[PDB]
Design a protein around this ligand. Structure first.
Ligand SMILES: Cc1cc(Oc2ccc(CC(=O)N3CCN(C)C(=O)C3)cc2)ccc1C#N
Length: 187
């Protein structure tokens, strides 16, 4: 039922110490927008994972020019402060839906209207911790030879292959995607 090359591929050099379930996304990515707002891929995968398996989500730079680097640093700020749930949707909608986020100051404004004080954002933005988080996201992308998003990796060894699943129907696609992660997570 689950064959290498159909629902998933296998990295030739597995990534030592990778997060068990690792998602890569970009706020510029249209498929990542639907994974968040329509398909809820992340919460559907989470419903089917075994006990205690942690899910990690990293932002990538190669979409959207110099604003893409700023969005990776902003996602680092969100992870450092734990405000992902308050900024994920306003950032997606400001980048892709309204296209009113076009600069670092527009990103900042999203965090402030979500309740993060400007002095707290500026401190985090310039911290060593966020510097380390930016480098961490870029290293994981390089370590899996990432070329596009959305992408999801299981135990640093298996890469989901959504174009090898049924993409004609949204509910079947979500169930095949989440069941593949569950199968691979038990390996
Ligand atoms: C039912 C459905 C099914 C879909 O199926 C996908 C899903 C993800 C991908 C991955 C992808 O888009 N990319 C970007 C290009 N590159 C270089 C990559 O490696 C990966 C593809 C099809 C997408 C949307 C919807 C909807 N509603």
């Amino acid at each position: 039922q689950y064959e290498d090359g159909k629902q998933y591929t296998t990295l030739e050099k597995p990534v030592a110490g990778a997060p068990q379930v690792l998602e890569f996304f970009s706020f510029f990515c249209p498929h990542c927008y639907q994974f968040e707002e329509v398909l809820h891929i992340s919460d559907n995968v989470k419903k089917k994972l075994p006990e205690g398996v942690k899910m990690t989500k990293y932002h990538v730079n190669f979409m959207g020019g110099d604003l893409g680097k700023d969005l990776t640093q902003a996602w680092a700020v969100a992870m450092a402060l734990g405000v992902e749930d308050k900024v994920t949707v306003p950032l997606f909608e400001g980048v892709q839906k309204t296209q009113t986020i076009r600069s670092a100051s527009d990103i900042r404004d999203v965090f402030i209207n979500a309740g993060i004080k400007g002095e707290e954002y500026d401190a985090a933005w310039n911290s060593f911790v966020v510097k380390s988080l930016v480098a961490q996201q870029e290293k994981a992308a390089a370590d899996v030879q990432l070329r596009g998003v959305p992408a999801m990796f299981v135990n640093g060894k298996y890469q989901l292959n959504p174009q090898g699943m049924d993409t004609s129907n949204m509910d079947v696609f979500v169930q095949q995607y989440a069941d593949t992660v569950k199968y691979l997570s038990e390996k």
